UniProtKB/Swiss-Prot annotation, chain B:
One of its GO terms (biological process) is regulation of DNA-templated transcription. This is DNA-binding protein Fis. InterPro entries: Fis_DNA-bd, Homeodomain-like_sf, HTH_Fis, Trans_regulatory_Fis. PANTHER family: DNA-BINDING PROTEIN FIS (PTHR47918:SF1). One of its GO terms (cellular component) is invertasome. NCBIfam families: PRK00430.1. Homodimer. Belongs to the transcriptional regulatory Fis family. It comes from the Bacteria. Residues 67-86 bind DNA. Its main location: cytoplasm. Keywords: Activator, Cytoplasm, DNA-binding, Transcription, Transcription regulation. Pfam families: HTH_8.
Length: 98, 91
DNA sequence: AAATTGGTTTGAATTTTGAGCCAATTT
DNA sequence: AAATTGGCTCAAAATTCAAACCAATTT
């Protein structure tokens, strides 16, 4: 009665395919393509912060949306994110969203 | 100025970069839309898992399996890396 | 008025990290 | 045969966490 929704199809992105049809593809693939383009435009330079880079790039919208969803309520936001309220406050401060 | 971007196409078949954070935002708007006041519980682990896997796989590809160099690239400890690889069953 | 949240501490629990050591592997 | 990496343990550092108050805000 309930069709299986795989974890990769929970957070998805609209795309256009070879028959110009709009389809949902996983966000993972977006991350993959971004990283592939990042590597491709590197041309042999040394990296030491890739994790923090991606993490910032993903934490910022997440906090933005969850704060919009809860209408500024840090406690609910922290409770639905599954993190400590102090951690959430820390992160909010880190990205100037206080 | 934006190091992490993805490719988009418009109705005029022009291709253009866009920050990855826009994708993440879209995905979340869609997520919040599909569920109707159902409760969210572990959204951080959700997204973090959706993002850590392709990162590890791509960095492991770029370094052809060299965990030490991968770890150096990412800026985390090699132990942390082994742990994350274990977590997502990539070892 | 009552309930909830924000802002802030404290100290324990968990995670991350660095260093070491040597077999195993790559160079 | 030299140099580097993988796997593991160990201790420190750093981060996350709950829990506790009470003023401030929302209901």
């Amino acid at each position: 009665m309930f069709e299986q929704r795989v974890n990769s199809d929970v957070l998805t992105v609209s795309t256009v395919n070879s028959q110009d049809q709009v389809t949902q593809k996983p966000l993972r693939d977006s991350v993959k393509q971004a990283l592939k383009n990042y590597f491709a435009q590197l041309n042999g330079q040394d990296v030491n912060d890739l994790y923090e880079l991606v993490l910032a790039e993903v934490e910022q919208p997440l906090l933005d949306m969850v704060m919009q969803y809860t209408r500024g309520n840090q406690t609910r936001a922290a409770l639905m994110m599954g993190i400590n309220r102090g951690t959430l406050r820390k992160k909010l401060k880190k990205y100037g969203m206080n």
